Coordinates of C-alpha atoms and ligand atoms in Angstrom, one line a residue:
Chain A
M34 CA -1.1 13.3 12.7
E35 CA -2.2 16.9 13.0
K36 CA -4.6 17.7 15.8
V37 CA -7.8 17.8 13.8
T38 CA -11.3 18.7 14.9
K39 CA -14.6 18.4 13.0
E40 CA -13.9 21.9 11.7
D41 CA -11.1 20.6 9.5
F42 CA -13.3 18.5 7.3
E43 CA -15.8 19.8 4.8
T44 CA -18.8 17.5 4.1
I45 CA -19.3 16.8 0.4
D46 CA -21.9 14.0 0.4
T47 CA -23.6 11.4 2.5
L48 CA -22.5 7.8 2.4
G49 CA -25.0 6.1 4.7
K50 CA -27.0 6.3 7.9
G51 CA -27.4 3.9 10.9
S52 CA -28.9 3.5 14.3
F53 CA -26.5 5.9 16.0
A54 CA -23.8 6.5 13.4
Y55 CA -23.6 8.0 9.9
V56 CA -20.9 8.3 7.3
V57 CA -20.1 11.3 5.2
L58 CA -17.7 11.9 2.3
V59 CA -15.4 14.7 3.5
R60 CA -12.5 16.7 2.1
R61 CA -9.8 17.8 4.5
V62 CA -9.7 21.6 4.5
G63 CA -6.6 23.0 2.9
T64 CA -6.1 19.9 0.7
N65 CA -7.6 17.9 -2.2
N66 CA -7.8 14.7 -0.1
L67 CA -11.1 12.9 0.4
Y68 CA -12.0 10.5 3.2
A69 CA -15.0 8.6 4.6
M70 CA -15.8 10.0 8.0
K71 CA -17.9 7.9 10.4
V72 CA -19.7 10.1 13.0
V73 CA -20.8 8.1 16.1
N74 CA -23.0 9.4 19.0
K75 CA -21.1 8.9 22.2
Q76 CA -24.2 8.1 24.3
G77 CA -25.2 5.6 21.6
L78 CA -21.9 3.8 22.0
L79 CA -22.4 3.5 25.7
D80 CA -26.0 2.3 25.4
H81 CA -25.0 -0.3 22.8
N82 CA -22.0 -1.5 24.9
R83 CA -19.6 -0.8 22.0
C84 CA -16.7 0.7 24.0
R85 CA -14.6 -2.4 23.5
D86 CA -15.2 -2.4 19.8
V87 CA -14.1 1.2 19.6
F88 CA -11.0 0.6 21.7
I89 CA -10.0 -2.3 19.4
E90 CA -10.6 -0.3 16.3
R91 CA -8.7 2.8 17.5
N92 CA -5.9 1.3 19.6
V93 CA -5.2 -2.2 18.1
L94 CA -6.3 -2.5 14.4
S95 CA -5.1 1.0 13.6
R96 CA -1.5 -0.1 14.6
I97 CA -1.7 -3.3 12.5
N98 CA -2.8 -1.3 9.4
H99 CA -3.8 -4.6 7.7
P100 CA -3.9 -4.2 3.9
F101 CA -7.4 -5.8 3.7
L102 CA -9.0 -3.9 6.6
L103 CA -10.2 -0.3 6.2
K104 CA -7.4 2.2 6.9
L105 CA -8.0 4.6 9.8
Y106 CA -6.3 8.0 9.5
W107 CA -7.8 10.0 12.4
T108 CA -10.0 9.5 15.5
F109 CA -11.2 12.6 17.4
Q110 CA -14.1 13.8 19.4
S111 CA -16.6 16.7 19.7
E112 CA -18.8 17.3 22.7
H113 CA -21.3 14.6 21.8
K114 CA -19.7 12.5 19.1
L115 CA -16.6 10.4 18.1
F116 CA -15.3 10.8 14.6
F117 CA -13.4 8.1 12.6
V118 CA -11.8 9.4 9.4
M119 CA -11.1 6.4 7.2
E120 CA -10.2 5.6 3.6
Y121 CA -12.8 6.4 1.0
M122 CA -13.3 3.5 -1.3
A123 CA -15.0 4.7 -4.5
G124 CA -14.4 1.4 -6.4
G125 CA -17.6 -0.2 -5.2
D126 CA -18.1 -3.5 -3.4
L127 CA -17.8 -7.2 -4.4
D128 CA -21.5 -7.7 -4.9
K129 CA -21.7 -5.1 -7.6
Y130 CA -18.5 -6.3 -9.2
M131 CA -19.6 -9.9 -9.4
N132 CA -23.0 -9.0 -10.7
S133 CA -21.3 -7.2 -13.6
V134 CA -19.1 -10.0 -14.8
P135 CA -20.3 -12.8 -17.2
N136 CA -22.1 -15.7 -15.6
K137 CA -21.7 -13.9 -12.3
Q138 CA -18.6 -16.1 -11.8
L139 CA -15.0 -15.1 -11.0
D140 CA -12.3 -17.3 -12.5
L141 CA -10.2 -19.5 -10.2
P142 CA -7.1 -17.1 -9.9
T143 CA -9.3 -14.2 -8.9
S144 CA -11.5 -16.2 -6.5
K145 CA -8.4 -17.6 -4.9
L146 CA -6.7 -14.2 -4.5
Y147 CA -9.9 -12.6 -3.1
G148 CA -10.4 -15.6 -0.8
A149 CA -6.9 -15.3 0.5
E150 CA -7.2 -11.5 1.1
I151 CA -10.5 -11.9 2.9
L152 CA -9.1 -14.9 4.9
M153 CA -6.1 -12.8 6.0
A154 CA -8.5 -10.1 7.2
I155 CA -10.8 -12.5 9.1
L156 CA -7.8 -14.2 10.7
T157 CA -6.5 -10.9 12.0
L158 CA -9.9 -10.0 13.4
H159 CA -10.2 -13.3 15.2
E160 CA -6.7 -12.8 16.7
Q161 CA -8.2 -9.7 18.4
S162 CA -11.3 -11.6 19.5
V163 CA -13.4 -9.7 16.9
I164 CA -16.2 -11.7 15.1
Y165 CA -17.2 -10.0 11.8
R166 CA -20.6 -11.7 11.9
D167 CA -21.8 -10.2 8.5
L168 CA -19.3 -11.5 5.9
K169 CA -21.0 -11.0 2.5
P170 CA -20.1 -9.5 -0.9
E171 CA -21.8 -6.2 0.0
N172 CA -19.4 -5.8 2.9
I173 CA -16.3 -6.4 0.8
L174 CA -15.1 -3.2 -0.7
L175 CA -12.7 -2.9 -3.7
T176 CA -9.7 -0.6 -4.0
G177 CA -8.9 1.3 -7.1
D178 CA -6.5 -1.4 -8.1
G179 CA -8.9 -4.3 -7.4
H180 CA -8.0 -5.7 -3.9
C181 CA -10.6 -6.7 -1.3
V182 CA -11.0 -4.7 2.0
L183 CA -13.5 -5.6 4.7
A184 CA -16.1 -2.9 5.5
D185 CA -16.2 -1.2 8.9
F186 CA -17.2 -4.0 11.2
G187 CA -19.0 -1.6 13.6
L188 CA -21.5 -0.8 10.9
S189 CA -22.0 -4.4 9.8
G190 CA -28.0 -11.0 0.7
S191 CA -27.7 -11.6 4.4
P192 CA -30.3 -14.4 4.6
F193 CA -28.2 -16.4 2.1
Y194 CA -25.1 -16.1 4.2
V195 CA -26.5 -16.7 7.7
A196 CA -25.0 -19.7 9.4
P197 CA -27.1 -22.5 11.0
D198 CA -25.6 -21.5 14.3
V199 CA -27.1 -18.0 14.1
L200 CA -30.5 -19.1 13.0
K201 CA -30.8 -21.7 15.8
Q202 CA -29.2 -19.9 18.7
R203 CA -28.2 -16.4 17.7
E204 CA -24.8 -17.4 19.2
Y205 CA -21.9 -15.8 17.4
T206 CA -18.5 -17.5 17.4
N207 CA -15.5 -17.6 15.0
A208 CA -17.2 -20.5 13.3
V209 CA -20.0 -18.3 11.9
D210 CA -17.4 -16.3 10.0
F211 CA -16.0 -19.5 8.5
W212 CA -19.5 -20.6 7.5
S213 CA -20.0 -17.2 5.7
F214 CA -16.5 -17.5 4.2
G215 CA -17.5 -20.9 2.7
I216 CA -20.7 -19.3 1.3
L217 CA -18.6 -16.5 -0.2
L218 CA -16.0 -18.9 -1.8
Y219 CA -18.8 -20.9 -3.4
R220 CA -20.5 -17.7 -4.6
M221 CA -17.3 -16.4 -6.3
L222 CA -16.6 -19.7 -8.1
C223 CA -20.2 -20.8 -8.9
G224 CA -22.1 -17.6 -9.6
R225 CA -24.7 -18.2 -6.9
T226 CA -24.9 -19.1 -3.2
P227 CA -25.4 -22.8 -2.4
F228 CA -28.8 -22.5 -0.6
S229 CA -31.7 -20.7 -2.1
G230 CA -35.5 -21.0 -2.0
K231 CA -38.7 -19.3 -3.0
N232 CA -39.0 -17.5 0.4
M233 CA -37.0 -17.0 3.6
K234 CA -38.5 -20.1 5.3
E235 CA -37.3 -22.4 2.5
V236 CA -33.8 -20.7 2.4
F237 CA -33.4 -21.3 6.2
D238 CA -34.5 -24.9 6.0
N239 CA -32.0 -25.6 3.2
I240 CA -29.2 -23.9 5.2
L241 CA -30.1 -26.1 8.2
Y242 CA -31.0 -29.4 6.5
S243 CA -29.9 -29.6 2.8
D244 CA -26.7 -31.3 1.7
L245 CA -24.2 -29.0 0.0
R246 CA -24.3 -29.5 -3.8
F247 CA -22.0 -28.1 -6.4
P248 CA -23.2 -27.1 -9.9
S249 CA -22.5 -29.8 -12.5
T250 CA -21.9 -27.0 -15.0
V251 CA -19.0 -25.3 -13.2
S252 CA -15.5 -26.8 -13.1
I253 CA -14.3 -26.5 -9.5
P254 CA -11.0 -28.0 -8.3
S255 CA -11.4 -30.9 -5.9
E256 CA -9.5 -29.0 -3.2
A257 CA -11.9 -26.1 -3.5
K258 CA -14.9 -28.5 -3.0
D259 CA -13.1 -30.0 0.0
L260 CA -12.5 -26.7 1.7
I261 CA -16.0 -25.4 1.0
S262 CA -17.5 -28.6 2.2
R263 CA -15.6 -28.4 5.5
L264 CA -16.5 -24.7 5.9
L265 CA -20.2 -25.6 5.4
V266 CA -20.4 -28.4 8.0
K267 CA -23.7 -27.7 9.7
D268 CA -22.5 -28.2 13.3
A269 CA -20.1 -25.5 14.4
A270 CA -18.3 -27.9 16.7
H271 CA -17.2 -29.9 13.6
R272 CA -16.6 -27.0 11.2
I273 CA -13.0 -26.5 10.0
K274 CA -11.2 -23.9 12.1
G275 CA -8.8 -21.1 11.2
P276 CA -5.5 -22.9 11.3
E277 CA -6.7 -25.7 9.1
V278 CA -8.4 -23.2 6.7
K279 CA -5.1 -21.4 6.3
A280 CA -3.1 -24.6 5.8
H281 CA -5.6 -26.1 3.4
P282 CA -4.3 -27.4 0.0
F283 CA -6.7 -25.1 -1.9
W284 CA -4.2 -22.3 -1.2
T285 CA -1.5 -24.0 -3.2
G286 CA -0.2 -21.6 -5.8
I287 CA -0.7 -18.4 -3.6
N288 CA 1.8 -17.1 -1.1
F289 CA 0.1 -15.3 1.7
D290 CA 3.2 -13.2 2.4
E291 CA 3.2 -12.0 -1.2
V292 CA -0.6 -11.4 -1.0
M293 CA 0.0 -9.2 2.2
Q294 CA 2.7 -7.3 0.2
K295 CA 0.2 -6.6 -2.7
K296 CA 2.5 -8.5 -5.1
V297 CA -0.3 -10.7 -6.5
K298 CA -2.5 -8.5 -8.7
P299 CA -6.0 -9.4 -9.9
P300 CA -5.4 -10.7 -13.5
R301 CA -8.5 -9.0 -14.9
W302 CA -9.1 -5.9 -12.8
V303 CA -11.4 -3.3 -14.5
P304 CA -10.4 0.0 -13.0
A305 CA -13.1 2.7 -13.3
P306 CA -12.5 5.9 -11.3
Chain B
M215 CA 5.2 -15.7 -7.5
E216 CA 4.3 -17.6 -10.6
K217 CA 7.2 -18.6 -12.8
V218 CA 7.7 -16.4 -15.8
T219 CA 10.1 -15.7 -18.7
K220 CA 10.5 -13.0 -21.3
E221 CA 7.8 -14.6 -23.4
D222 CA 5.1 -13.7 -20.8
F223 CA 5.4 -10.0 -21.2
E224 CA 4.3 -7.8 -24.1
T225 CA 6.1 -4.6 -24.7
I226 CA 3.7 -1.6 -24.9
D227 CA 6.3 1.2 -25.1
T228 CA 9.9 2.2 -24.2
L229 CA 10.5 4.1 -21.0
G230 CA 14.3 4.5 -20.9
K231 CA 17.4 3.6 -22.9
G232 CA 20.8 3.0 -21.4
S233 CA 24.4 1.9 -22.3
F234 CA 23.8 -1.8 -21.7
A235 CA 20.2 -1.9 -20.5
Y236 CA 16.7 -0.5 -21.3
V237 CA 13.4 -0.1 -19.4
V238 CA 10.1 -0.8 -21.2
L239 CA 6.5 -0.6 -20.2
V240 CA 5.0 -4.2 -20.4
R241 CA 1.8 -6.1 -19.9
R242 CA 1.7 -9.5 -18.4
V243 CA 0.1 -11.6 -21.2
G244 CA -3.3 -13.0 -20.2
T245 CA -3.9 -10.1 -17.7
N246 CA -4.5 -6.4 -17.7
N247 CA -1.5 -5.8 -15.4
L248 CA 1.3 -3.5 -16.4
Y249 CA 4.9 -3.4 -15.1
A250 CA 8.2 -1.8 -15.9
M251 CA 10.8 -4.3 -17.0
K252 CA 14.5 -3.5 -17.1
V253 CA 16.5 -5.7 -19.5
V254 CA 20.3 -5.9 -18.9
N255 CA 22.7 -7.2 -21.5
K256 CA 25.0 -9.6 -19.7
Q257 CA 27.9 -8.1 -21.8
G258 CA 27.8 -5.0 -19.6
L259 CA 28.6 -7.1 -16.5
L260 CA 32.3 -6.9 -17.4
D261 CA 32.5 -3.5 -15.7
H262 CA 33.0 -4.1 -12.0
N263 CA 30.7 -1.2 -11.2
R264 CA 27.7 -2.5 -13.3
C265 CA 28.4 -6.0 -12.1
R266 CA 28.3 -5.1 -8.5
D267 CA 25.1 -3.0 -9.0
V268 CA 23.2 -5.9 -10.6
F269 CA 24.5 -8.2 -7.8
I270 CA 23.1 -6.0 -5.2
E271 CA 19.7 -5.8 -7.0
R272 CA 19.4 -9.5 -7.6
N273 CA 20.6 -10.7 -4.1
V274 CA 19.9 -7.9 -1.6
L275 CA 17.4 -5.3 -2.8
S276 CA 15.1 -8.0 -4.2
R277 CA 14.5 -9.2 -0.7
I278 CA 13.4 -5.8 0.8
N279 CA 9.8 -4.8 1.2
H280 CA 9.4 -1.1 1.9
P281 CA 6.7 1.4 1.0
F282 CA 9.2 3.8 -0.4
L283 CA 11.5 1.4 -2.2
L284 CA 10.4 0.4 -5.7
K285 CA 8.6 -3.0 -5.6
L286 CA 10.1 -5.9 -7.5
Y287 CA 7.7 -8.6 -8.7
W288 CA 10.0 -10.9 -10.7
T289 CA 13.7 -11.4 -11.6
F290 CA 14.9 -13.9 -14.1
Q291 CA 17.5 -14.4 -16.8
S292 CA 17.8 -15.6 -20.4
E293 CA 20.9 -16.9 -22.2
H294 CA 22.3 -13.4 -22.7
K295 CA 20.1 -11.0 -20.7
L296 CA 18.8 -10.2 -17.2
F297 CA 15.3 -9.1 -16.4
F298 CA 13.8 -7.1 -13.5
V299 CA 10.0 -6.7 -13.6
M300 CA 9.1 -3.9 -11.1
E301 CA 6.1 -1.8 -10.4
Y302 CA 5.3 0.9 -13.0
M303 CA 5.0 4.3 -11.2
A304 CA 2.2 6.3 -12.8
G305 CA 3.1 9.7 -11.4
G306 CA 6.5 9.9 -13.2
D307 CA 9.4 11.3 -11.2
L308 CA 10.1 14.1 -8.8
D309 CA 12.2 16.0 -11.3
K310 CA 9.4 16.5 -13.7
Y311 CA 6.9 17.3 -10.9
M312 CA 9.1 20.0 -9.3
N313 CA 9.6 21.6 -12.7
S314 CA 5.9 21.9 -13.1
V315 CA 4.9 23.5 -9.8
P316 CA 5.0 27.4 -9.7
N317 CA 8.4 28.8 -9.1
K318 CA 9.6 25.1 -9.0
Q319 CA 9.2 25.2 -5.2
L320 CA 7.3 22.6 -3.2
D321 CA 5.5 24.0 -0.1
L322 CA 6.7 23.1 3.4
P323 CA 4.1 20.3 4.1
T324 CA 4.9 18.5 0.8
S325 CA 8.7 19.0 1.2
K326 CA 8.6 17.6 4.7
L327 CA 6.5 14.6 3.7
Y328 CA 8.5 13.7 0.7
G329 CA 11.7 14.3 2.7
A330 CA 10.4 11.9 5.4
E331 CA 9.5 9.2 2.9
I332 CA 12.9 9.5 1.2
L333 CA 14.7 9.4 4.5
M334 CA 12.9 6.3 5.6
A335 CA 14.0 4.6 2.3
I336 CA 17.6 5.7 2.8
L337 CA 17.7 4.6 6.5
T338 CA 16.4 1.1 5.5
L339 CA 19.0 0.8 2.8
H340 CA 21.8 1.7 5.3
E341 CA 20.5 -0.9 7.7
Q342 CA 21.1 -3.4 4.8
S343 CA 24.6 -2.0 4.1
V344 CA 23.5 -0.5 0.7
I345 CA 24.8 2.9 -0.3
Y346 CA 22.3 4.4 -2.8
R347 CA 24.9 6.9 -4.1
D348 CA 22.6 8.3 -6.8
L349 CA 20.0 10.1 -4.8
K350 CA 18.4 12.8 -7.0
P351 CA 14.9 13.8 -8.2
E352 CA 15.2 11.8 -11.4
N353 CA 15.5 8.7 -9.2
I354 CA 12.5 9.5 -7.0
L355 CA 9.4 8.1 -8.6
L356 CA 5.8 9.1 -7.7
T357 CA 2.9 6.7 -7.1
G358 CA -0.5 7.3 -8.6
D359 CA -1.5 9.0 -5.3
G360 CA 1.6 11.2 -4.9
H361 CA 4.0 9.3 -2.6
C362 CA 7.8 9.2 -3.2
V363 CA 9.5 5.9 -4.0
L364 CA 13.2 5.4 -4.6
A365 CA 14.0 3.8 -7.9
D366 CA 16.0 0.6 -7.2
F367 CA 16.1 -1.3 -10.5
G368 CA 16.4 1.5 -13.0
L369 CA 19.1 2.7 -15.4
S370 CA 22.3 4.4 -14.0
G371 CA 21.3 16.5 -12.8
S372 CA 23.8 13.9 -11.4
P373 CA 26.7 16.4 -11.2
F374 CA 24.6 18.7 -9.0
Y375 CA 24.1 16.1 -6.3
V376 CA 27.7 14.6 -6.0
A377 CA 29.2 15.0 -2.5
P378 CA 32.8 16.3 -1.9
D379 CA 33.6 12.8 -0.6
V380 CA 33.2 11.4 -4.1
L381 CA 35.0 14.2 -5.9
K382 CA 38.1 14.0 -3.6
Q383 CA 38.6 10.2 -3.1
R384 CA 36.2 8.6 -5.5
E385 CA 35.2 6.8 -2.2
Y386 CA 31.8 6.1 -0.7
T387 CA 30.3 5.8 2.8
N388 CA 26.8 6.3 4.1
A389 CA 27.6 10.0 4.3
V390 CA 27.3 10.5 0.5
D391 CA 23.6 9.6 0.7
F392 CA 23.1 12.3 3.4
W393 CA 24.9 14.9 1.3
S394 CA 22.6 14.1 -1.6
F395 CA 19.6 14.2 0.8
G396 CA 20.8 17.7 1.9
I397 CA 20.9 18.9 -1.8
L398 CA 17.4 17.4 -2.3
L399 CA 15.7 19.1 0.7
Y400 CA 17.3 22.4 -0.5
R401 CA 16.0 21.8 -4.0
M402 CA 12.4 21.2 -2.9
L403 CA 12.2 24.2 -0.6
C404 CA 14.3 26.7 -2.7
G405 CA 13.5 25.8 -6.3
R406 CA 17.2 25.2 -7.2
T407 CA 20.3 23.3 -6.1
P408 CA 22.8 25.1 -3.8
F409 CA 25.8 24.7 -6.1
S410 CA 25.8 25.6 -9.8
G411 CA 28.0 27.0 -12.5
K412 CA 28.6 27.8 -16.1
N413 CA 30.3 24.4 -16.6
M414 CA 31.1 21.2 -14.7
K415 CA 34.4 22.4 -13.4
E416 CA 32.8 25.4 -11.8
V417 CA 30.0 23.3 -10.2
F418 CA 32.6 20.9 -8.7
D419 CA 34.7 23.8 -7.4
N420 CA 31.7 25.3 -5.6
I421 CA 30.8 21.9 -4.1
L422 CA 34.4 21.4 -2.8
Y423 CA 35.2 24.9 -1.5
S424 CA 32.1 27.3 -1.5
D425 CA 30.2 27.8 1.7
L426 CA 26.5 26.9 1.5
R427 CA 24.3 29.8 0.7
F428 CA 20.6 30.1 1.0
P429 CA 18.5 32.3 -1.2
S430 CA 17.5 35.8 0.0
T431 CA 14.2 35.6 -1.8
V432 CA 13.0 32.4 -0.2
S433 CA 11.9 32.1 3.4
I434 CA 12.3 28.7 5.1
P435 CA 12.1 27.7 8.8
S436 CA 15.3 28.0 10.8
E437 CA 14.9 24.3 11.5
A438 CA 15.0 23.5 7.8
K439 CA 18.0 25.7 7.3
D440 CA 19.8 24.0 10.2
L441 CA 19.2 20.4 9.0
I442 CA 20.3 21.2 5.4
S443 CA 23.4 22.9 6.8
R444 CA 24.2 19.8 8.9
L445 CA 23.7 17.6 5.9
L446 CA 25.9 19.7 3.7
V447 CA 28.9 19.7 5.9
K448 CA 31.7 19.0 3.4
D449 CA 33.9 16.8 5.6
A450 CA 32.2 13.4 5.7
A451 CA 33.3 12.5 9.3
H452 CA 31.6 15.7 10.7
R453 CA 28.5 15.4 8.6
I454 CA 25.2 14.6 10.4
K455 CA 24.4 10.8 10.6
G456 CA 21.3 8.8 10.3
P457 CA 19.9 8.8 13.9
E458 CA 20.6 12.5 14.4
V459 CA 18.9 13.2 11.1
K460 CA 15.8 11.3 12.1
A461 CA 15.6 13.0 15.5
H462 CA 16.1 16.5 14.0
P463 CA 13.6 19.2 15.0
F464 CA 12.8 19.8 11.4
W465 CA 10.6 16.7 11.5
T466 CA 8.4 18.2 14.3
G467 CA 5.1 18.0 12.5
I468 CA 5.7 14.5 11.1
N469 CA 5.2 11.1 12.8
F470 CA 7.5 8.6 11.0
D471 CA 5.3 5.6 12.1
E472 CA 2.3 7.2 10.3
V473 CA 4.4 8.1 7.2
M474 CA 5.4 4.4 7.0
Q475 CA 1.8 3.4 7.0
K476 CA 1.0 5.9 4.2
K477 CA -1.4 7.8 6.6
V478 CA 0.2 11.2 5.7
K479 CA -1.1 12.2 2.2
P480 CA 0.4 14.9 0.0
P481 CA -2.1 17.8 0.4
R482 CA -1.9 19.1 -3.2
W483 CA -1.4 16.0 -5.3
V484 CA -2.5 16.3 -8.9
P485 CA -3.2 12.8 -10.2
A486 CA -2.9 13.6 -14.0
Ligands
LIG112 CL1 -5.7 22.7 -1.9
LIG113 CL1 -13.9 -4.0 28.1
LIG114 CL1 -21.9 12.7 25.8
LIG115 CL1 -19.2 2.0 15.7
LIG116 CL1 -0.3 0.4 -0.5
LIG117 CL1 17.0 -17.0 -12.9
LIG118 CL1 29.8 -2.0 -2.1
LIG119 CL1 28.5 6.3 8.7
LIG120 CL1 24.6 6.8 9.5
LIG121 CL1 10.3 3.8 12.0

């Protein structure tokens, strides 16, 4: 790619702020092309021990160009900052989309496709020893044609998706992602998360101690219940792991190769540029 | 893919009409998804040419996944017809696009990107032993975000892109695709094809015997002129081949790995 510097991008708007990074909507000078540019303080990266994360993002994930991870176009530096010019997703996120559909529920074909796309993303991250840690609808972005893409993992509701492991020990492993994935699958199919409460204390107690229950009013295939139940085993040591999740009978009727090729479209996508 | 038949697609409009096949815009019933479906009357398979083309589409091209080859979702048959459900390209084709831009000329960055994407498609076809043989702007479709995609399952302008190899022998090698590629690069940069005439006989005589001539009113890099000239060598044996085309200095400002990942966007794309 061209040897760009910060001078080659015109800031149009702000897309968010963080501890030591911010994201701006930019237009590449001389073109009509828009991008989401993440600007990260170099000293901040060093103080937060994020150099490995940056190396993986820039030198490993960028080569994979996974369809359901955010696309990276350019990385470059200034004196004090590193810049990551990434795809601008104006189609919103999955939290907003699900809150706008009737009953808050996605039908089975859509839930299964989005579950497969998200699973492929999570499996790719784990292969690179990256734990997403914050899987939730707000961090799943939608393309213009209705496919799911994981939000920038460096950047990042949450109380409902936290695993027992994190509440008890703050210990992050691949299993916490599969717990959150089970919460997400349940949410897409049922219209709500499985564990709630009148305050955070009750929510955490239910996450730790309450048996999983499915709504009597929602028709869920037995295979989906089986997979969600195994993803939401309380003890991480006995939780279903990646290979068994990918081989689970719930994925009957969806071909992961065709999903990776974008040949399985969302049946009811509502484009809205 | 889920099993389908003709009954699962509702015709919205007609996109193209051909001798023994037509393309329609369709919607998968029960969804909001749109596709382009080519319908081929099996009666037209008596022609060895049309029979071979459909054979290649059903058995070879159907198995290729490439960003710049048109995507095929389903292929199936009825008692007397054949069906190809492919991606509907919202941007239309490169012939209409180039006839809309001022002076009918694409700028150098756009010409180089589109040339790179088309070259990647051609090289992949040759690796699969497929000769496209009909490379021209009408067969280059445009995605909603401005990328070029070779039409693979469409209906069979054309006289301006035919190589001397075809005119002399009626015989085809990989070289005919690189001749058409030469004509296309010249068209994008210069606003017209190199060889024209007042009738078809004049056009063919110029292709066979007239030395390539570049316009005096259009300035193009010497590297672009060199590559087009190597592509438009009339003797097939001495025409530039695939690997030398890919390594040519004209592609200096392009990285083909990034183009394959759709990380090089067209700078002026007008999604209308
Ligand atoms: Cl511009
Ligand atoms: Cl390290
Ligand atoms: Cl510094
Ligand atoms: Cl970061
Ligand atoms: Cl794509
Ligand atoms: Cl069939
Ligand atoms: Cl052949
Ligand atoms: Cl050859
Ligand atoms: Cl060759
Ligand atoms: Cl390559």
